[PDB]
């Protein structure tokens, strides 16, 4: 699910031509505002996360009666730097980072049983308060026989620290997107970079016309279902009595 | 002919309910968000996104409707026989 | 003996009698040769 | 023959009214505010968002409606069966 | 207020409605374990 | 949940970029209007937070009988100051600010009992006169039975407090906010800053777009389902007659 | 399914030749801006394969009793560079690229069963967590009985390297479509070379003329059916029970 | 189903008189552009036998046990170049090209029987991968009974190759198409030669207009019916029961 940062950059070169970005206006070629393009592609990715699923992660948290609240940042979570104060109770999954849990999705005990997220009232509900924390209940320990849990969660790539030695290659960079959302990436880069430039009776909708395009593509890319689609078959017929 | 007849039209009607797609459901694209799938499919109450109203969102196949012709020719064609032979047989129903 | 053991193995569900179904569908089956062979048993014996 | 088919219907009725969505109750978003909807949820009177009239905002989902069809058919089968047979069996309905 | 008469203003909520299948398929299975007994029992219904 | 300041700072450089809040002329360079720039990103915040939930906080009240009016104030609060003319009865919860109380939800008393708020003639029903208080009448304290409350409430988080000497850095200031939000964020604050500058008939209605975009974002986010959401399956079987 | 890059050159003169990239504007006479022509001719095939099927590729995974995750990347596949940490067991197949799994559609073991994607509580379901990996749980290999499986997958196909001696001819690269989507390519082409150039009324709108041809033809080729289209005929009388 | 190239240049005149390509502005008579022409009205042609039918051909492949994917192309066709790697298999048919198929549409044994393509479940199915290549399953083989095969599928003609000594005459060349398509044709060549040019009001609309006239002769033709249409009519009275 990766692509070099030197293409995209080659390609962003034919629809950023028209400004300071990319070009001398001699011999045209790339500037040393990198950075600046680095940002936004970040963002770009973030939001492309937002619109699709694209992936999914996974932890395993270790109980402790008597705890009220977990939350689930990258302070807790083993391998990471072991704050003196906490206890690392996040002992497996993938490595968390700033903008890793977009929305926790499933919680699965040991026994393989599946617990309810903001289902009030339901027999042993799970509340996130702040939405990167489990509130646990005391009656989940009074009826809980887990000793573990493992979450699943909707995931967004962690992106890579550029630095001002590495101004050198830049080209290792990996963006990490299928090549569909690539072509998706692009319009949205060059609505974001050509909004603010141009007093010109046609040149000033450059912006909104490349903001409409990423909608269109968007929606082309959710009608041809490239991206991860669980649909449920519950049983029904091993409950006893449905047959 | 007369078995010819209703042996074909006997078996039309059973491929016509047979090849249907009953029991499968089929939802919109874009109506159920992730969280409010999961639900839906669990078996609790969910959400639905606005302008996308459930009596047309989802839809649950069903057999097929069969046309009135069929039931008339499979009569028409027991009458006949029955007429050719002579022998009622106190049948094309409850034996009494 | 085949031909006897297939038309006794539909009155009674069983072997080659019961239906192959998915997982997650019904595999319910009304006996209707059983059903009619009750009908008949003791209309049959009684005269004797 | 007709054991099969009396079979695979009655299964085919079973699966549409069991794989269905009955019991389950649907609200559109953002027709109700979060002290609404808990009142709603609680049992108590509530008031709902302009434009979203209840009888369109909530939905509860019931069994769906079996075609004209499936009766007939079973119908037809145990009639063929019993003419068949030749005892009526006293059936397909109060054994009286 | 003027633009919202009561009649779509208010609405007070009550039982929805069955669909005609839940009752057919009730007395269908009724009707077929009657046939497979054999005894009426004098049953769904009165029991006169 | 949890963003530099550092990073906001340097995406709202790309869409800044036609006004003074950011740029030179030459060699476009952040300004020190960063003051007035924060002002406005935690008006934005509270904004955000008043769209969505994004939190929810506890309290808990220790009861005194005869008793009136309780108020929630960060003066009767543990561990605030203790003002002399109050007695600081809140003894536990989420440190109290002045923007922390958007809206009272559930009150729960020590037995578990759930009472009712602002829904007249009910059995024991608790009214809030003025919003962040609550009035209790002397029917509670004849069938009350419980000495003390939980209250929850929809939250906003309290700025972090920034000076002059902490000019220097202002990077390590933390916005409070998911990602996705924080992409909304971006919009709602090039409009309020963008709306009052410009003569030209395209440079005249940035604002006005600015503020499109943000209403279709959040539009977005809310069809993309990225906030809580409670969803009530009560029992109804248990009250003894519905089996 | 190939064509020589040379025709596609010829032809692409007849709509760029009021531009740069083809023409001296004395002697109209192709540029030596073949390397651009080609990285956007490259994005424009990769389009149409996601519009149309036109492909579909096999592989041919050993399974290891333990394994849970599966990754189908071109550092696991037979004849490909074999990376010391990991085992190389994709071991038939077409060769893979970066770009080649669109995605995943149907997987049958080495007994002619066909299990499930990503259809959950069904018997044996498998599961993409990332899109270009298959997760695959313990009671698989509890009920599994099958050592192998193949996997059907969507393709898209690998660009042939450009080089600097390469330069010379560039005449015997080959693009990898049908005649067909040739038609369409030259439209998309096109437009994304025109977009970013001109300044008068009616010049202005060649990019947005072109984008509207090119829906045009992808829905006339759509009506014409000259893309693949499996359609599905069951059994549905073999599983006994019905006839 | 020939014209003369003669022809069509002359009346192609009385079209593109406006314009360079075929007139001196003084004593106004073809110019030698003629190759870029040629490359036009190929293309044209193609884009004809894509719309209608006009053409069908036929194949006969003799199968060979045990072979998994047979490619359609001119190095295994009898007649053909020998390459030396590959068995020559296709040993009766129209000559084949590079562009030559364009859809396969019906396969017949040599016992009379008519297999199914890309009818996924159906008793002995055939696969095309890559839409000029036939997958045959070890099933086929099987239960074939067939020794041999003849395919059928939608033609377009191979150009003819012009040369530089040929520059003498170029009117002996014969365009592959009916007279009707003919007057579409002209059409068509105009809009594509006539889009990039002119500069005033009423002169950049022409490439429009052209491109209207064309899609309106086209729909002409389709209602006056001037090309092949195959009707069915099954038997469905011998199978043994419907009678």
Redesign the interface.
Known sequence: ???LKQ?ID??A???L??IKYVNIDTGALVLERVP?LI??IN?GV??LH??F??????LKIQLEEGRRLYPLRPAYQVGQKPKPGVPQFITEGNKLG??SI??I??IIGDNGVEY?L?????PLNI??????VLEISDEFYCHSSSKTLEVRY?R?PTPMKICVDNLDSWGCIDIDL???HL?ALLYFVAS??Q??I???????QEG??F?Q?YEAECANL?A??????????????TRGG?? | DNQRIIGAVTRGMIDTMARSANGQVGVMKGALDVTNRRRFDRGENYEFNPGADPRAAVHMHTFPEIPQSAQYMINLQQAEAESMTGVKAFNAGISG | ITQINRWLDYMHVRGEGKPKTEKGKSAVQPPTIRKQAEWRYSSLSEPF
Chains 1, 6, 7, 8 share one sequence.
């Not at chain 1, 141009?198 to 000033?204: D, H, R």
């Open positions: 699910t990766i692509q293409v080659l390609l070169e034919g629809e031509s028209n600046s940002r936004a963002l973030l939001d937002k619109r699923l694209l992936k999914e992660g996974m700033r903008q977009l929305k999705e499933k309810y903001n289902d009030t009232w339901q509340t996130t308060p702040e939405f990167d909707r967004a299928p090549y569909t072509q974001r970079c909004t603010p141009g007093f010109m009776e046609n040149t000033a909104f016309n903001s395009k959710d041809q279902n490239l991206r991860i689609d669980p649909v449920g078959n519950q049983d029904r017929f449905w047959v």
